RNA sequence: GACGCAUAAAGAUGAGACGCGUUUUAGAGCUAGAAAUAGCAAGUUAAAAUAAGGCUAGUCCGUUAUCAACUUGAAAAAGUGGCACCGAGUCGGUGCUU
DNA sequence: CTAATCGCCAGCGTCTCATCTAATTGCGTCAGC
DNA sequence: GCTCTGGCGATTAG
């Protein structure tokens, strides 16, 4: 007996079929186990498996990072307390305790209920003097009197905890930048640097610069309007750098210095001055103007007598808010009394009371209040403010996302420099506080673990706790920046032990250029066939036409080389379009940088180069590059080092160094490069050298050279296709096992992926898994593995009237797999099947094995939102001591699996034990506690005298079978899902597909009237379809109300055309599809869903255990338990 | 079938940081009143938590992938279910055979 | 003191750095013959 | 040669 397997792979399904030799599906008699009353089930060999798609590991990553940002921040404050503790032991020895316990309710506090002062009068006075924290910060910055230590700590902690962003490097001075009339100093500097009496346009001032946007479309208009220049730099060649930075890196005018090379504000300025000193300013005022623009974009109050602009801006905002509020209140009271209580007392709307106490944002408040004041009188200023987002604003909003940290730090400095006079400790350890504020872990060091994390790579120099003060004396920076890169680069395919070489490297470029050049097929009149060049000619031509220029075309090789002879016009070439795809770029760059010849041509020096290009590829910071290059300082001049350290390379190659240079034969003593250079009159390239038996370069690879999951998990692609592939691999294995341990003859695969290599990998995996019997001479193909496109099956489907609709049932996966197998087997035989009646019989079969994979749930504990306190038993505590009846908490957890527990429980007024049997919900949070010791766990839950052996665990999608062939799957401890299929006969499906798509052609225009005539003489199929649906829904669905609503809805619309009627009959199958109930739409009526919330009807049913294929089964009669 | 150079649109993993949002508490409400109530005044901020927690005690870990039942085995992992013919409402009927 | 109904709710925006994959073009190779 | 779908708080009725 010989058979064949057909498969169809997807993201949420897989379909399998087995055909013997005539496109016929066999049938067999399998046996069942358990305490039931069955012994044999007759099953057909075709079906599908259904699961739910996997998901990427990105979201989890984000959560992890967020965690790491709350562990460090809480430390950032604790350090500060360590510096204040002793001093704070003298003023109030309970300040920190109250700050810690402020969250608890009034009764759980073991101290006073006022955090700061411990009094009522002092607290009220403090809140009255400083309405906000910004008043306190500005007062501490600007005043000169002795303050209280508590206020200093509060201000410092508020600045340390919220510390701005780190996107700008350098120094920023708000005092010298808030004055935006500096442009006159720019004009006078421009006049003094270039004496030609420049002209300018009067009318453009600081405010016009303020309104300018980052988009160059408005920037060009601003620059042409502000000054009509006299030269290229005047128009836009220089002012762009002054306004924002020299973003272009190409010469706009020769007069800048020589060319244009400056960039924006980063760590490059300290070297970019080398561009200007050679051509000695506007470059100093450019920074001031750019800083002025970028700082006045966010700050309104310019500095006159204050060193704190941010606090002044916030105070001004607060005062304007108060004034606008009182004016609006008075006017609204005077002109529209009826709306008053609607806007200032109701929290359920978007009024002012819903803006402060409710949950509305600025946009909703403005959109709700604009029409209210639109029809009023005396609302011009408020209306114009509402269009600029300045009406009744708050201090802490989203717009604060663009505050640099260099602002915050500035204020901190001031707050110390005064109060250090009265407190010696502040002067003693000011630098500690600054370092606490402005310390960040570099992105190339990562976590600071001690070998217990699978994410870290850091290497230490000693053994001691790591703090911001002794960071650079415990951790190692070069050894960490090296491992940050060495843990991601590829290995050499030929030898899986060596690291690859950087893409730009002298050895690698030599290999590439010689490999390309050695196969030149030059032809001449005298020599009719393409010969191969000799070693000395290559050695001459490489330096003649490669070490002097980087780019060479065909003309250069045809003319320049043959100048010594007369055959320059008689040599023709082939295999090159117009140039060579190789160059000695690194050689030319090092020649320009070093300006020396012998150091590059000498072989003995190449080792040094092998490091000079290595570091320039690994590191990215200037400091570490300089530290590594310090070793070779004496080799070149200081100017040479300064110009060299500005060169950066990226990328990596694919061939290591041990293979290109370092391995040689024992009978020749030459390396691959040597042979490729001087093979002789007949030359061979890398591919011919490596795959050669005359020299011992083959066996070296063989002597230089595993579970399934760890090999699957290394493919490239989305995890969904990986899940599908892993399922298919096991489906094939079980199918092989079932039918007598005889391997198939063909396997036909078809992929279907959406957002020609994954198919080649799956085919490789299956072929390597199947072909094991290895011959001894050379290689045997016991089985084949065919690959098929998706067009052929679709054409065979749409040509012979084998239509399909996906809304009826889940039977189309198996039919697709069967058709794939049939078409492939037929097609690989001739180098359109026969007896189509067999195909129709197979596709009209009522028995197909559809199984849904059972799974235990994983994920988050419960819903992420925190709910207000209320008296209920569904609230989950947030910490252990926070009782949800006083602080709120989470609700609606997620269950992992359920358990069938049978035992006694006290009940009734008599307080007596009664036998009971119920399900239970073991949440994700409680899984470990149950699995560690179940008996105690569910004895503390209420039950007692529990039988140990009768406990059964039921994952999601467990299958129960009830009376009259009614199947329900399980979804939770208190909900069920439908589990049956509808097997509609083929003729109804064929008619129903043709009725739809009525207005659009399906084939030739001359062969379409027959389909119409068919639909008019078979119009009366709709009643039969409705009767079929009604009978099925009466037998297995039990949805009488929805069914008799659907019946009336259909009966009311019998006069509509056929197209709409059929297109809406298609919509009615949502009532009978398995899975979760869903709401569908008829013509105009809407039908709501019916959900099964009672799970007590499956405790007397039969529990079915199923295999992945679905043919092996186990049945348990639950009526005998108890 | 696989390997080394010449290409412009998407993804897939890991690291370092900002700005909001939500819960509880603090910021003394007044007057007419027997009562349920009514009239007025105020509103912009701060503290703590941000998966319950763990031991290996780190300025570290805790939402990805894997998962029918029974027998052996801590785990790794290994094993367990007859064949032909006629038919078709979720699979039946007949004949050999352990 | 439980079973059939109808209805409402679910955390979200942004910035820097590094390493891998891959479909088609033309280049010359092996695998084989 | 060449190859979306479970939880939760209300309603009236057996």
């Amino acid at each position: 007996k010989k058979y064949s397997i057909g498969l169809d792979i997807g993201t949420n399904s897989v379909g399998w079929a087995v055909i013997t030799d005539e496109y016929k599906v066999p049938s067999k008699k399998f046996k069942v186990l358990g305490n039931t009353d069955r012994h044999s089930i007759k099953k057909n060999l075709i079906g599908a498996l259904l699961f739910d798609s996997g998901e990427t590991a990105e979201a989890t990553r984000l959560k992890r990072t967020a965690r790491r940002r709350y562990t460090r921040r809480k430390n950032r404050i604790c350090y500060l307390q360590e510096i204040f503790s002793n001093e704070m032991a003298k003023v109030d020895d309970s300040f920190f305790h109250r700050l810690e316990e402020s969250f608890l309710v009034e009764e759980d506090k073991k101290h006073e209920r006022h955090p700061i002062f411990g009094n009522i009068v002092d607290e009220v006075a403090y809140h009255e003097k400083y309405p906000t924290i910004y008043h306190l910060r500005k007062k501490l910055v600007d005043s000169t009197d002795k303050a209280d230590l508590r206020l200093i700590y509060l201000a410092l902690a508020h600045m340390i905890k919220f510390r701005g962003h780190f996107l700008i490097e350098g120094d920023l001075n708000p005092d010298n930048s808030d004055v935006d009339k500096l442009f006159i100093q720019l004009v006078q500097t421009y006049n003094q640097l270039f004496e030609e009496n420049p002209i300018n346009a009067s009318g453009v001032d600081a405010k016009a610069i303020l309104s300018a946007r980052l988009s160059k479309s408005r920037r060009l208009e601003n620059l042409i309007a502000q000054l009509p220049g006299e030269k290229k730099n005047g128009l836009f060649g220089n002012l762009i750098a002054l306004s924002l930075g020299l973003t272009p890196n190409f010469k706009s005018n020769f007069d800048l210095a020589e060319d244009a090379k400056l960039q924006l504000s980063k760590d490059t300025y300290d070297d970019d001055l080398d561009n200007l000193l050679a051509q000695i300013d506007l470059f100093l005022a450019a920074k001031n103007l750019s800083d002025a623009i970028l700082l006045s974009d966010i700050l309104r109050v310019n500095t006159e007598i204050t060193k704190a602009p941010l606090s002044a801006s916030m105070i001004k905002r607060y005062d304007e808010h108060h004034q606008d509020l009182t004016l609006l209140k008075a006017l609204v009271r005077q002109q529209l009394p009826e709306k008053y209580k609607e806007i200032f007392f109701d929290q359920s709307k978007n009024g002012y009371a819903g803006y402060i106490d409710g949950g509305a944002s600025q946009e909703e408040f403005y959109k709700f209040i604009k029409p209210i004041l639109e029809k009023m009188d005396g609302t011009e200023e408020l209306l114009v403010k509402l269009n600029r987002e300045d009406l009744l604003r708050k201090q802490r909003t989203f717009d604060n996302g663009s505050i640099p940290h260099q602002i915050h730090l500035g204020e901190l400095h001031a707050i110390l420099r005064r109060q250090e006079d009265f407190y010696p400790f502040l002067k003693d350890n000011r630098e500690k506080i600054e370092k606490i504020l402005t310390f960040r872990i570099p992105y190339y060091v990562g976590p600071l673990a001690r070998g217990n994390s699978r994410f870290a790579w850091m290497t230490r120099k000693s053994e001691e706790t790591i703090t911001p003060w002794n960071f650079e004396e415990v951790v190692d920076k070069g050894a960490s920046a090296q491992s940050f890169i060495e843990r991601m680069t590829n290995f050499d395919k030929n030898l899986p032990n060596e690291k690859v070489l950087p893409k730009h490297s002298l050895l690698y470029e030599y290999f590439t250029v010689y490999n390309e050049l050695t196969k030149v097929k030059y032809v001449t009149e005298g020599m009719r066939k393409p010969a191969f060049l000799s070693g000395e000619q290559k050695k001459a031509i490489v330096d003649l036409l490669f070490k002097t220029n980087r780019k060479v075309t065909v003309k250069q090789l045809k003319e320049d080389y043959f100048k010594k002879i007369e055959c320059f016009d008689s040599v023709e070439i082939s295999g090159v379009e117009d140039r060579f795809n190789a160059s000695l770029g690194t050689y030319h760059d090092l020649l320009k940088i070093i300006k020396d010849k012998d150091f590059l041509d000498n072989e003995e020096n190449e080792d040094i180069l092998e490091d000079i290009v290595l570091t320039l590829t690994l590191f990215e910071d200037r400091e570490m590059i300089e530290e590594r290059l310090k070793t070779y300082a004496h080799l070149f001049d200081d100017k040479v080092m300064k110009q060299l350290k500005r060169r950066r390379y990226t990328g990596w190659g694919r061939l290591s160094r041990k293979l290109i240079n370092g391995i040689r034969d024992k009978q020749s003593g030459k390396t691959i490069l040597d042979f490729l250079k001087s093979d002789g009159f007949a030359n061979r390239n890398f591919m011919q050298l490596i795959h050669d038996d005359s020299l011992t370069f083959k066996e070296d690879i063989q002597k230089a050279q595993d579970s399934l999951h760890e090999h699957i998990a290394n493919l490239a692609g989305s995890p969904a296709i990986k899940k599908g592939i892993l399922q298919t691999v096991k489906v094939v294995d079980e199918l092989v096992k079932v039918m007598g341990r005889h391997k198939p003859e063909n396997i036909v695969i078809e992929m279907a992926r959406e957002n020609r290599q994954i198919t080649k990998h799956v085919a490789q995996i299956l072929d390597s898994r199947m072909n094991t019997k290895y011959d001894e001479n050379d290689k045997i193909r016991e089985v084949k593995v065919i690959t098929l496109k998706s067009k052929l099956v679709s054409d065979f489907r749409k040509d012979f009237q084998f239509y399909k609709v996906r809304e009826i049932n889940n039977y189309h996966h198996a039919h697709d797999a069967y058709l794939n197998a049939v078409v492939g087997t037929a097609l690989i035989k001739k180098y359109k099947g026969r007896d189509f009646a067999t195909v129709r019989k197979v596709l009209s079969m009522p028995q197909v094995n559809i199984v849904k994979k059972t799974e235990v749930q994983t994920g988050g504990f419960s819903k992420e939102s925190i709910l207000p306190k209320r008296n209920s038993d569904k609230l989950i505590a947030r910490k252990k001591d926070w009782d949800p009846k006083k602080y709120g908490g989470f609700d609606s957890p997620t269950v992992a699996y359920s358990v069938l527990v049978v035992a006694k429980v006290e009940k009734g007024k008599s307080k007596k034990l009664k036998s009971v049997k119920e399900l239970l919900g073991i949440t994700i949070m409680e899984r470990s506690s149950f699995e560690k010791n179940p008996i105690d766990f569910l004895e503390a839950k209420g039950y007692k005298e529990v039988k140990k052996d009768l406990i059964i665990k039921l994952p999601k999608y467990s299958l129960f079978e009830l009376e009259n062939g009614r199947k329900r799957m399980l979804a939770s401890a208190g909900e069920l899902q439908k589990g049956n299929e509808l097997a509609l006969p083929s003729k109804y499906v064929n008619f129903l597909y043709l009725a739809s798509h009525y207005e659009k052609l399906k084939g030739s225009p001359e062969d379409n009237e027959q389909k119409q005539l068919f639909v008019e003489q078979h119009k009366h199929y709709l009643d039969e379809i409705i009767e079929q649906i009604s009978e099925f829904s009466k037998r297995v669905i039990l949805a009488d109300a929805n069914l008799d609503k659907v019946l009336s809805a259909y009966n009311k619309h019998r006069d509509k055309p056929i197209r709409e009627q059929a297109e809406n009959i298609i919509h009615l199958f949502t009532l009978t599809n398995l899975g979760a109930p869903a709401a569908f739409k008829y013509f105009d009526t809407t039908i709501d869903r019916k959900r099964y919330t009672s799970t007590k009807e499956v405790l007397d049913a039969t529990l079915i255990h199923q295999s992945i294929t679905g043919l092996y089964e186990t049945r348990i009669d639950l009526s005998q338990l108890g």
Side-chain angles (χ1 to χ4, degrees), chain A residues 978 1029 1039 1042-1043 1045-1047 1049 1064-1073 1077-1090:
Chain A
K978 313 163 274 163
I1029 298 184
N1042 295 53
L1043 186 50
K1045 202 176 305 173
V1046 159
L1047 277 181
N1064 295 48
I1065 301 299
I1066 296 178
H1067 280 107
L1068 293 161
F1069 290 119
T1070 310
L1071 182 57
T1072 74
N1073 278 121
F1080 56 101
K1081 272 188 62 180
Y1082 202 52
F1083 263 120
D1084 276 346
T1085 65
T1086 296
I1087 315 295
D1088 213 8
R1089 53 189 183 142
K1090 182 183 191 295

Side-chain angles (χ1 to χ4, degrees), chain A residues 856 895-899 920-923 927 930-931 953-955:
Chain A
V856 185
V895 298
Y897 55 80
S898 49
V899 292
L920 194 46
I922 311 290
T923 43
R927 178 184 174 183
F930 182 90
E931 285 179 0
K953 78 184 275 281
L954 311 161

Side-chain angles (χ1 to χ4, degrees), chain A residues 327-345:
Chain A
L327 158 68
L328 181 73
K329 206 188 274 184
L331 183 63
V332 159
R333 168 89 56 71
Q334 183 283 349
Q335 199 172 314
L336 277 80
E338 179 50 44
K339 298 298 293 295
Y340 192 84
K341 199 191 280 288
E342 193 38 67
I343 318 182
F344 292 74
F345 277 100

Side-chain angles (χ1 to χ4, degrees), chain A residues 482-497:
Chain A
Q482 186 176 2
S483 290
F484 173 74
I485 292 278
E486 284 199 337
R487 74 196 303 272
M488 288 157 208
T489 66
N490 265 340
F491 278 93
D492 204 336
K493 296 294 188 146
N494 310 117
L495 285 82
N497 266 14

Side-chain angles (χ1 to χ4, degrees), chain A residues 340-525:
Chain A
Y340 192 84
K341 199 191 280 288
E342 193 38 67
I343 318 182
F344 292 74
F345 277 100
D346 192 359
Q347 319 188 7
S348 43
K349 312 278 290 193
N350 308 335
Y352 196 73
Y355 179 60
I356 295 302
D357 281 323
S361 64
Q362 279 194 185
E363 271 86 330
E364 282 162 90
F365 174 64
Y366 288 175
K367 193 210 51 175
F368 165 81
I369 200 166
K370 168 178 259 191
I372 305 312
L373 61 89
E374 180 82 345
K375 72 199 168 197
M376 265 162 91
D377 283 339
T379 51
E380 286 73 16
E381 287 285 352
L382 308 183
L383 198 41
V384 74
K385 280 208 186 327
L386 188 153
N387 295 101
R388 302 199 287 105
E389 307 277 89
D390 203 2
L391 177 75
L392 300 173
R393 263 188 82 74
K394 284 176 166 178
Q395 329 294 325
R396 309 212 60 205
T397 47
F398 39 81
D399 210 323
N400 292 7
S402 68
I403 295 274
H405 76 103
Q406 287 112 345
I407 305 297
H408 286 262
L409 169 59
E411 313 202 10
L412 178 136
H413 208 61
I415 289 158
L416 303 170
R417 281 263 317 258
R418 316 258 193 201
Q419 306 280 310
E420 64 89 16
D421 207 337
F422 309 93
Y423 296 90
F425 288 97
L426 278 297
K427 187 174 60 174
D428 208 311
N429 47 34
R430 172 178 61 206
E431 291 305 8
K432 260 187 179 185
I433 309 181
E434 270 96 13
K435 173 58 90 184
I436 287 180
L437 198 148
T438 179
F439 174 55
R440 277 179 63 201
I441 286 176
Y443 75 105
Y444 52 82
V445 159
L448 296 163
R450 273 216 283 116
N452 285 320
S453 68
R454 74 180 181 83
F455 303 108
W457 61 82
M458 181 215 57
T459 67
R460 299 191 175 191
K461 260 166 47 180
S462 165
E463 270 288 349
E464 198 176 3
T465 55
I466 289 178
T467 69
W469 308 304
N470 71 345
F471 186 69
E472 280 156 289
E473 310 175 60
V474 173
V475 65
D476 192 359
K477 301 206 60 195
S480 306
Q482 186 176 2
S483 290
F484 173 74
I485 292 278
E486 284 199 337
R487 74 196 303 272
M488 288 157 208
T489 66
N490 265 340
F491 278 93
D492 204 336
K493 296 294 188 146
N494 310 117
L495 285 82
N497 266 14
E498 297 325 286
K499 282 274 155 197
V500 295
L501 261 186
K503 185 80 167 62
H504 316 97
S505 179
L506 294 174
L507 268 188
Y508 198 78
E509 307 281 306
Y510 273 10
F511 165 83
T512 293
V513 65
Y514 273 131
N515 183 17
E516 174 156 296
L517 193 86
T518 187
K519 281 291 181 174
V520 59
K521 47 185 68 79
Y522 66 96
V523 74
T524 317
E525 273 86 338

